[PDB]
Amino acid sequence: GTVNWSVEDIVKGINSNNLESQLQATQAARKLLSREKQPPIDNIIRAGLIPKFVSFLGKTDCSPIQFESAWALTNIASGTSEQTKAVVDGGAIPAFISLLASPHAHISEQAVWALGNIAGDGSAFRDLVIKHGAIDPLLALLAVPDLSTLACGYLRNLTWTLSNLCRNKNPAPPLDAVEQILPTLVRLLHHNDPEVLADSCWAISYLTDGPNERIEMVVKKGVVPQLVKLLGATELPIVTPALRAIGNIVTGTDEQTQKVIDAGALAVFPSLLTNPKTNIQKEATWTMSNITAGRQDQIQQVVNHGLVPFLVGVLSKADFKTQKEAAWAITNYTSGGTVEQIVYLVHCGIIEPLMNLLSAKDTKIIQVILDAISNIFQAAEKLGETEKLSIMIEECGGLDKIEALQRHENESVYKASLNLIEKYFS
């Protein structure tokens, strides 16, 4: 009988000061707010119901109204920032945090969920949840000998909320909050549930999304090898964030990048660089480009793992965004590599697919490619083989393309294309 009430009926029941009447009206609100299509969130807010729901959260003597109000508030907080704000403005944060201590699992779970929605709004509400002291009691819920004893849905909700507490930038989460949460994240990273693993990998992705100091906090926990293992998972929803985290780490120092290599990450790239999921191939190629921007010994590891042919492959055929990352990978390679490494690159067949991409109308990739060709020519100069190279480029139709780029709209483009022709083609 709590199905399809009007907001007016709900207000009447909640204002009755009959606890049972209040419970029934709150449940009716929960059901209204639970419908997928246009729940009357703003109407509930305007009716002034939020403070009432928040008050009901504190009714330890009536667990059902605690649960119903927690659920109702959760769904209001799942809306726009303004709707989440109305929940926060009603004093919900400390009330939900107190509910984390409820002896009723379904109730503490609902509080976890609601706090996830609030923190998920952005860095301000995230940090406000942290300031109210949510982390300790959240982490306490996970303090058991074996995660497997927790209900699956329960652990998934907790993991997700924790990941939202690691989420967002400007600013990033407080350093001490991150240190507090990390050890639990590391443990979750070793759990066997696919959804827990996915969200945990996303959490690590957020945390490594910043300057080297932020990256270092994660790497020093020793999680890199586990992330590399997760790179090989069959579940693509695990691979995506695992690879994002790994990619974030190699944007750091040479030493942080080396940890990724030492952990054996490169052995997985033959598969990642040919992955049928476009976005995985893209971030795999992005990751490669940051590794080829590393030291010569790190470029050499790329060579040893046979990944150059895979980069030629991606450059030859892939989604355009991926090809652009491949272009960057090649320019970095040619920029930081030895003459021998550059010779090897050309021998792998890089030239033709490079020239073919000059046909694209993205001004940046053209710049990247022209820079790569200059780098390769510099290497040929040291070998006095600049003539072999010029012939290579002309035979696959590169000369024709480079010549036309002399007339290019863009500044740096027609310039550099001019230096090339003037310098090695006349």
């Binding site: 639970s34 997928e36 809306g79 996830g116 939202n164 989420r167 964030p241």
Partner: peptide, 22 residues
């Protein structure tokens, strides 16, 4: 050579907020 960031495809990420349906 510089190290570079990569755009974040939001549709790949966990939801920021979740409505409980049942």
């Amino acid at each position: 050579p510089r190290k570079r960031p990569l755009e974040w495809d939001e549709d790949e990420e966990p939801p920021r907020k979740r409505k409980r349906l049942w």
